[PDB]
Amino acid sequence: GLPWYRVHTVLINDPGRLIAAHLMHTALVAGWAGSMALYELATFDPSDPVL
Amino acid sequence: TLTYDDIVGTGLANKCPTLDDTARGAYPIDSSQTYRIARLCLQPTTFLVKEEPKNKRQEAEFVPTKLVTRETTSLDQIQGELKVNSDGSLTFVEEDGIDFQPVTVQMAGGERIPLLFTVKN
Ligand code: CLA
Ligand code: CLA
Ligand code: CLA
Ligand code: CLA
Ligand SMILES: CC1=C(/C=C/C(C)=C/C=C/C(C)=C/C=C/C=C(C)/C=C/C=C(C)/C=C/C2=C(C)CCCC2(C)C)C(C)(C)CCC1
Ligand SMILES: CCCCCCCS[C@@H]1O[C@H](CO)[C@@H](O)[C@H](O)[C@H]1O
């Protein structure tokens, strides 16, 4: 079978599932951005931009 | 002249009475007669809270706040003696009335500041 480091090559000849994988990757990155901002808002102290 | 049912739910019950722009007169004081305040009403329109800074060498400022306890803030039906003093000044001595309201305001960032808004005594 395909070795583990080649599993994603099944997308080479499948434009539609390549778009799906790219959409999923884009979903994960945008999801990271949203979660990261929420975590920072839950920890940021806005009371002193000086020190 | 309005009745309770004209007023109820409108928010007007938390507002003090007003006078017209033409009420720029003068009320004579007879130093031999005694006087009282039959009604004193105080309607807060701004609550400001002094910031508590870390440096303590900058002058702390009063900053705006958000009222979260709704139209429940005014003092009213306050009464007391209005003395005429030897020097012609007047002194109001509060004796009774709805002279306190608990109030919670919120600073920027969410910190809640409860206070007893009052003119007791
Ligand atoms: C846009 C970036 C990009 C894309 C779309 C690809 C795509 C591909 N790579 Mg290439 N590659 C890249 C960049 C990229 N690569 C970089 C930066 C390197 C150097 C690190 C390589 C080195 C490389 C090698 C040596 C090989 C590939 C192979 C492949 C093919 C199979 C991948 C697979 O099945 O993995 C399956 C992977 C796993 C099942 C698990 C991987 C676990 C990783 C290592 C640990 C954690 C990763 C983590 C989630 C990443 C977070 C994102 C990061 C950027 C912060 C596929 C066409 C293979 C190939 O040519 O097949 C014919 C192959 O042998 N790539
Ligand atoms: C951008 C991320 C991404 C995307 C879009 C794909 C997409 C695809 N994968 Mg790949 N894969 C990925 C990452 C990804 N993979 C990573 C990180 C690994 C190493 C674990 C693999 C290992 C892998 C294998 C072994 C196979 C695929 C296969 C495939 C295809 C079928 C779907 C599947 O079986 O996935 C299965 C992959 C997963 C279920 C990955 C989930 C693992 C992570 C750790 C889950 C974490 C989520 C969790 C909620 C967060 C944890 C937080 C922590 C604090 C606890 C599809 C093209 C299949 C294929 O078609 O082969 C020909 C297949 O057999 N992938
Ligand atoms: C009408 C012309 C047109 C437009 C506007 C685009 C636009 C795009 N394509 Mg390309 N593409 C086109 C023609 C076009 N394509 C043609 C004729 C082919 C040959 C089939 C390709 C083959 C192709 C591939 C293989 C891939 C792209 C991808 C992309 C996207 C990368 C950016 C991204 O994901 O941002 C992030 C997303 C947003 C900021 C949100 C966008 C919101 C969308 C536009 C609303 C979608 C509604 C609409 C009905 C869905 C169809 C859209 C489609 C026309 C692109 C972007 C939306 C990549 C992709 O989709 O990655 C996920 C990708 O892998 N295109
Ligand atoms: C320029 C921006 C950029 C680019 C070019 C990429 C490129 C890639 N990302 Mg994405 N990613 C990005 C930003 C980006 N990322 C951001 C901002 C986030 C949110 C944090 C993500 C979250 C993300 C996830 C969750 C996943 C990807 C994955 C991928 C790979 C999919 C193709 C593949 O099969 O690779 C095959 C894999 C390789 C070629 C190996 C890449 C190794 C990287 C460069 C460093 C690995 C570090 C170390 C060895 C392991 C991590 C340590 C561990 C303790 C965490 C491709 C390398 C997927 C992937 O790796 O699937 C296996 C995947 O699951 N990315
Ligand atoms: C479905 C849906 C929804 C929802 C959504 C959501 C809720 C999402 C989320 C999302 C998310 C929440 C996401 C997240 C993501 C994340 C990520 C993706 C991350 C990653 C990470 C990484 C990759 C890392 C790595 C590392 C480590 C770990 C260590 C150090 C080094 C490094 C950095 C490498 C709505 C309602 C809208 C509606 C429509 C449908
Ligand atoms: C989509 C996520 C929406 C979550 C919004 C939460 C309210 S917003 C949140 O409120 C806190 C208290 O007022 C502040 O300390 C904090 O800085 C602010 O980010």
Side-chain angles (χ1 to χ4, degrees), chain A, chain B residues 1-54 56 58 60-121:
Chain A
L2 287 174
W4 72 267
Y5 49 87
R6 295 187 191 162
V7 290
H8 293 161
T9 62
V10 295
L11 306 169
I12 292 183
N13 202 48
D14 191 338
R17 288 196 166 177
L18 179 67
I19 289 161
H22 284 175
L23 280 166
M24 186 62 60
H25 182 266
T26 310
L28 288 159
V29 175
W32 174 86
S35 318
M36 194 72 251
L38 292 172
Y39 177 85
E40 289 185 6
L41 290 170
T43 58
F44 178 60
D45 175 9
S47 68
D48 188 12
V50 177
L51 295 186
Chain B
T1 175
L2 303 180
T3 73
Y4 184 72
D5 285 294
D6 302 323
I7 277 173
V8 60
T10 64
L12 297 175
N14 196 50
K15 281 158 161 42
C16 293
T18 66
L19 302 181
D20 354 31
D21 300 5
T22 79
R24 314 291 180 168
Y27 182 71
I29 299 303
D30 187 287
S31 47
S32 82
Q33 187 62 47
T34 41
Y35 292 91
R36 57 173 289 166
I37 290 186
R39 179 186 177 182
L40 172 64
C41 184
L42 289 111
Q43 177 198 332
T45 56
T46 301
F47 294 93
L48 303 171
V49 174
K50 197 175 223 178
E51 283 188 324
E52 275 160 23
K54 307 143 64 174
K56 305 214 185 198
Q58 64 180 267
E61 38 208 324
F62 285 97
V63 296
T65 63
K66 253 181 180 183
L67 178 62
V68 296
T69 46
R70 304 177 75 188
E71 291 296 324
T72 60
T73 56
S74 287
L75 317 182
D76 200 0
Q77 303 189 59
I78 291 165
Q79 58 192 1
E81 179 190 18
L82 191 65
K83 293 180 188 158
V84 187
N85 304 313
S86 305
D87 67 349
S89 67
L90 312 182
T91 295
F92 171 59
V93 178
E94 194 250 357
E95 278 136 38
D96 196 12
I98 303 165
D99 60 9
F100 68 100
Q101 293 297 346
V103 179
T104 304
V105 300
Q106 224 168 266
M107 312 184 69
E111 190 186 4
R112 292 162 169 181
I113 313 295
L115 65 137
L116 196 77
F117 172 53
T118 189
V119 294
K120 277 176 175 317
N121 315 138

